[PDB]
Amino acid sequence: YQKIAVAVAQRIANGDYEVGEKLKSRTTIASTFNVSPETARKGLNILADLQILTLKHGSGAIILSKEKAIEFLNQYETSHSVAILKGKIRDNIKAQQQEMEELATLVDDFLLQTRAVSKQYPLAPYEIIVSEDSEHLGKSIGELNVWHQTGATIVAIEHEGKFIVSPGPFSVIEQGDHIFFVGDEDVYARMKTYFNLR
Amino acid sequence: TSKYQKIAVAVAQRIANGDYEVGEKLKSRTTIASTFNVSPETARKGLNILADLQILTLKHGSGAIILSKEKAIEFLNQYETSHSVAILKGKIRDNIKAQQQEMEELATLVDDFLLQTRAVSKQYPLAPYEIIVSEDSEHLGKSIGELNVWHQTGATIVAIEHEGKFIVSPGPFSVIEQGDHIFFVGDEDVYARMKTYFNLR
Amino acid sequence: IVTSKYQKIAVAVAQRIANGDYEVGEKLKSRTTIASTFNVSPETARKGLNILADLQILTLKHGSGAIILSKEKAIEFLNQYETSHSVAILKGKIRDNIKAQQQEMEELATLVDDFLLQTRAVSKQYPLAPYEIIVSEDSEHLGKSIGELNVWHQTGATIVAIEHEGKFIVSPGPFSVIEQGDHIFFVGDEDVYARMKTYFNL
Amino acid sequence: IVTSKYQKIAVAVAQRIANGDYEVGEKLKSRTTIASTFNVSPETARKGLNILADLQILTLKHGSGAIILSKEKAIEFLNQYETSHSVAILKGKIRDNIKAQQQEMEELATLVDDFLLQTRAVSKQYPLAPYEIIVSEDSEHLGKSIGELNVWHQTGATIVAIEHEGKFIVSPGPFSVIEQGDHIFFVGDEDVYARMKTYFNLR
DNA sequence: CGAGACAGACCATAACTATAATATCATGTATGGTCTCTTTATGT
DNA sequence: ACATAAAGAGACCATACATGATATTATAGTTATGGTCTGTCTCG
Numbered sequence: 001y002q003k004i005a006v007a008v009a010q011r012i013a014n015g016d017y018e019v020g021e022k023l024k025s026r027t028t029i030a031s032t033f034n035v036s037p038e039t040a041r042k043g044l045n046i047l048a049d050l051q052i053l054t055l056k057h058g059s060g061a062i063i064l065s066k067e068k069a070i071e072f073l074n075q076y077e078t079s080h081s082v083a084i085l086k087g088k089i090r091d092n093i094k095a096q097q098q099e100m101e102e103l104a105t106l107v108d109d110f111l112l113q114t115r116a117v118s119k120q121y122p123l124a125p126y127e128i129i130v131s132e133d134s135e136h137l138g139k140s141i142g143e144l145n146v147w148h149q150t151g152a153t154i155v156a157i158e159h160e161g162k163f164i165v166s167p168g169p170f171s172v173i174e175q176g177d178h179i180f181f182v183g184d185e186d187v188y189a190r191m192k193t194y195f196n197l198r
Numbered sequence: 199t200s201k202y203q204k205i206a207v208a209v210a211q212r213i214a215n216g217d218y219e220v221g222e223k224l225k226s227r228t229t230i231a232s233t234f235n236v237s238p239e240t241a242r243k244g245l246n247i248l249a250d251l252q253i254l255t256l257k258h259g260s261g262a263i264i265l266s267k268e269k270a271i272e273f274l275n276q277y278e279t280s281h282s283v284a285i286l287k288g289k290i291r292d293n294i295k296a297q298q299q300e301m302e303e304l305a306t307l308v309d310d311f312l313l314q315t316r317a318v319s320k321q322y323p324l325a326p327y328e329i330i331v332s333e334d335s336e337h338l339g340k341s342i343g344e345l346n347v348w349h350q351t352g353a354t355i356v357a358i359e360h361e362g363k364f365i366v367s368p369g370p371f372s373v374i375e376q377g378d379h380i381f382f383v384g385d386e387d388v389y390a391r392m393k394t395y396f397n398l399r
Numbered sequence: 400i401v402t403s404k405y406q407k408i409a410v411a412v413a414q415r416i417a418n419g420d421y422e423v424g425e426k427l428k429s430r431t432t433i434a435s436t437f438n439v440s441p442e443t444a445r446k447g448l449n450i451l452a453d454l455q456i457l458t459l460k461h462g463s464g465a466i467i468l469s470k471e472k473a474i475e476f477l478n479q480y481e482t483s484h485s486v487a488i489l490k491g492k493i494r495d496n497i498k499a500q501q502q503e504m505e506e507l508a509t510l511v512d513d514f515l516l517q518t519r520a521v522s523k524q525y526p527l528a529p530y531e532i533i534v535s536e537d538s539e540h541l542g543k544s545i546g547e548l549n550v551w552h553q554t555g556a557t558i559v560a561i562e563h564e565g566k567f568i569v570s571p572g573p574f575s576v577i578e579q580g581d582h583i584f585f586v587g588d589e590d591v592y593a594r595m596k597t598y599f600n601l
Numbered sequence: 602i603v604t605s606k607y608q609k610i611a612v613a614v615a616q617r618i619a620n621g622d623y624e625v626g627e628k629l630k631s632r633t634t635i636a637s638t639f640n641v642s643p644e645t646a647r648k649g650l651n652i653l654a655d656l657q658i659l660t661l662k663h664g665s666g667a668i669i670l671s672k673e674k675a676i677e678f679l680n681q682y683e684t685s686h687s688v689a690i691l692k693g694k695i696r697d698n699i700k701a702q703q704q705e706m707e708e709l710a711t712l713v714d715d716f717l718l719q720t721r722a723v724s725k726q727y728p729l730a731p732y733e734i735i736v737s738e739d740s741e742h743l744g745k746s747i748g749e750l751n752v753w754h755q756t757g758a759t760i761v762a763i764e765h766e767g768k769f770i771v772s773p774g775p776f777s778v779i780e781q782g783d784h785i786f787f788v789g790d791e792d793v794y795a796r797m798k799t800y801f802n803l804r
Numbered sequence: 805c806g807a808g809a810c811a812g813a814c815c816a817t818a819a820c821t822a823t824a825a826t827a828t829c830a831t832g833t834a835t836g837g838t839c840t841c842t843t844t845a846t847g848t
Numbered sequence: 849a850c851a852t853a854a855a856g857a858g859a860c861c862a863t864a865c866a867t868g869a870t871a872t873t874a875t876a877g878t879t880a881t882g883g884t885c886t887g888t889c890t891c892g
């Protein structure tokens with residue numbers, strides 16, 4: 001709505017529209033500023049309320065003054081001087097980067113804080129107890145060479161409730177401990193084969 | 199995840215955990231809704247969705263019976279292969295990277311934009327005044343610096359048009375020949391003083 | 400973070416169990432003990448107790464009461480609760496940042512549209528329009544007079560006016576002094592504008 | 602990025618004027634001439650001629666037609682239109698970029714929301730759950746077997762399975778080989794997970 | 805010199821369109837409610 | 849000591865108070881096609 005006002009103010013102040021001659025029709029005015037008759041009349045009423053034009057005759061209006069349009073354009077340019085717009089857009093994009101940095105550090109803190117865990121049911125730890133007598137008891141996982149012998153990967157050993165994960169080749173499985181491991185049904189059977197718990 | 203999915207995945211997880219046996223009968227809709235913080239309608243929709251996958255059976259207006267664990271297990275494997283945290287971790291990192299690339303593109307765009315603009319102001323108090331030094335003056339045939347224009351008249355010369363060729367920001371050396379057009383800034387008083395110096399009244 | 404009444408009851412009962420105030424063998428009552436204790440409605444209290452019993456924290460027998468079952472399960476449930484609450488708080492803060500950034504997006508869009516309007520309205524300006532630089536940044540040249548700077552000889556620019564506190568000092572002369580944040584209006588060409596920009600550190 | 606028919610008429614007529622085929626003092630009709638050439642209605646052609654004459658290029662006279670006035674004004678109008686077109690296409694590009702940013706932003710919002718679902722699902726997931734590592738970056742350790750790497754001695758981790766092409770190699774053993782982009786599943790504690798992360802070059 | 809025809813401009817309406825507001829529906833929670841089951845007390 | 853009856857508590861349920869989101873409708877908007885009237889030019 002203010003676009004038509006500033007355009008007609010520029011045209012009046014330029015001297016193309018001198019004070020005496022009548023204004024163009026609202027149709028031509030609307031067509032020139034790529035706007036429509038409805039906006040046009042709204043802008044003309046605004047400009048009239050600024051005591052710069054009088055809309056008394058439907059065919060056109062007689063321009064009342066020139067310095068008033070100059071003053072209105074001065075106020076608008078003081079509000080909108082391009083350079084002030086350049087400062088505003090630069091500050092605004094610096095702000096843009098500020099919120100992006102804040103969001104980046106937030107998401108980075110979130111990312112580092114959380115530990116990723118899985119839920120694939122195929123790979124659930126089966127728990128088995130080694131109460132039965134075995135020559136394989138009193139021996140280290142590395143000593144028994146578990147995987148080549150049974151195909152099992154030991155995930156944890158429960159001795160007197162002392163749960164230990166990723167046991168390595170040194171941990172020794174005592175009698176009556178609970179061995180937790182992965183593999184398929186065949187691997188589970190082989191583990192019961194090695195320990196004779198089947 | 200659909201609102202009519204959270205309930206399905208939660209119920210399937212509880213079934214797979216072993217809380218509900220095959221012969222066991224499920225609780226009421228409002229029980230599930232209260233335990234999973236949803237409305238009874240949404241819980242019912244989720245139960246219907248799960249029954250469409252035939253983990254659950256519906257032979258009663260409100261009752262339901264556990265049917266098979268392995269099918270629910272497969273449903274969990276599908277859901278995990280679609281959402282397993284680590285894959286979401288990769289997505290949340292890649293989306294941040296893509297947004298940073300978009301911001302860099304925007305920064306380059308706006309920088310090129312500002313470089314291309316190079317715009318001037320439109321101040322009406324800054325409007326120039328065109329005078330014609332056609333009249334004889336001792337001040338003709340002299341350099342702006344030689345005349346010392348500002349102290350003498352208060353005017354700041356912005357341009358000396360020589361037969362169409364403007365000399366903007368002319369400096370102290372440019373010499374104003376007779377009949378040239380001097381363009382300058384100042385107030386009405388300054389314009390009068392300039393006409394005083396050049397006797398163009 | 401806004402939650403539900405029965406959620407605030409459930410977590411409170413979980414902390415009470417963790418505190419050890421309620422014995423493992425005590426039989427509590429949702430209709431009278433819990434409801435009277437936390438001044439909440441009959442079914443609300445029950446909802447909380449059912450949430451606890453889902454996690455095997457409590458056992459709910461029809462017509463009898465809730466019975467304490469486990470301690471470490473309650474501790475684990477509590478810890479999961481703080482983890483989920485932290486995740487939700489971070490989600491809310493992210494959402495606030497997101498809304499602010501979207502609003503700043505529309506702000507930038509409106510600023511660009513207004514600049515397009517200004518650029519289109521240039522057709523009716525007066526010829527020989529002076530340029531305008533705002534000296535926001537600091538340069539040794541600040542706090543000096545035009546004459547001390549010898550501006551035309553440094554940059555090729557002829558200053559037509561300087562803006563300080565919304566006042567335009569048209570036709571400045573030598574004694575006039577450039578100050579930080581002011582708008583300097585000057586005539587010249589593309590080379591002159593670039594030279595002035597380099598000179599003022601901007 | 603789009604314009605009106607009368608704007609196109611005005612710019613085309615201005616370019617044709619700049620070509621110089623029309624005289625500096627030539628007269629032209631509209632309803633039976635410019636309208637027919639561009640296959641456009643008489644009033645849109647009038648609109649185009651009115652916007653062209655508004656900047657003091659042409660003069661339309663009631664029931665007389667138009668007369669050519671200025672060349673330099675036409676050139677200036679062409680320059681102004683080029684600048685306006687550049688500004689408009691830049692505006693369109695900015696709008697497209699912001700829309701893409703907003704769509705990606707909602708995507709991020711939903712993605713971080715779904716973490717609430719995964720965290721709430723943790724309460725009922727089976728104990729001793731292994732971790733999950735996606736080896737997307739390149740490490741010298743890639744293309745080697747678990748046994749060659751001697752993984753447990755390097756990181757403290759026990760690998761329970763590796764995912765290649767949506768296939769999980771449960772209970773891998775030594776000959777199994779880690780490949781780029783695969784998911785490595787392993788048991789351990791916080792220290793073990795951090796060690797594995799440092800080893801595979803994946804902050 | 806007068807009359808008729810053609811062209812242009814202005815007043816106008818309709819169609820293609822987008823945005824903004826309001827209403828309705830769904831997801832939700834809490835409270836009031838009713839019915840069933842279990843436990844305790846009293847009577848035979 | 850055993851059986852029956854009554855009371856209390858818990859669970860399943862529905863409705864109302866509520867808020868948020870989505871969809872639809874209306875209004876503001878602009879452009880194009882339209883018609884009528886007036887003015888100017890050409891021809892008789």
Ligand SMILES: Nc1ncnc2c1ncn2[C@@H]1O[C@@H]2COP(=O)(O)O[C@H]3[C@@H](O)[C@H](n4cnc5c(N)ncnc54)O[C@@H]3COP(=O)(O)O[C@H]2[C@H]1O
Nearest residue numbers: 343346347348354355370546549550551552556557558573
């Ligand atoms: N508005 C301005 N824009 C750009 N630079 C400015 C300026 N005002 C002052 N300066 C610079 O300061 C120097 C001294 O200016 P001052 O006004 O004392 O002394 C000036 C002035 O009295 C006069 N003068 C020069 N050009 C003038 C002009 N366009 N209008 C009015 N007077 C001018 O000649 C003297 C020497 O001028 P010179 O150019 O050698 O040297 C100038 C110039 O380099």
Ligand SMILES: Nc1ncnc2c1ncn2[C@@H]1O[C@@H]2COP(=O)(O)O[C@H]3[C@@H](O)[C@H](n4cnc5c(N)ncnc54)O[C@@H]3COP(=O)(O)O[C@H]2[C@H]1O
Nearest residue numbers: 142145146147153154169748751752753754758759760775
């Ligand atoms: N799934 C896995 N996770 C982590 N690291 C793995 C691994 N598979 C192999 N490695 C690493 O490679 C080395 C050789 O493994 P390999 O299977 O040939 O030879 C192994 C294996 O036959 C057996 N073994 C050790 N731990 C085992 C276990 N938990 N389960 C089954 N067998 C095991 O003892 C041998 C020596 O074991 P060590 O730990 O000294 O050395 C191991 C280990 O450092």
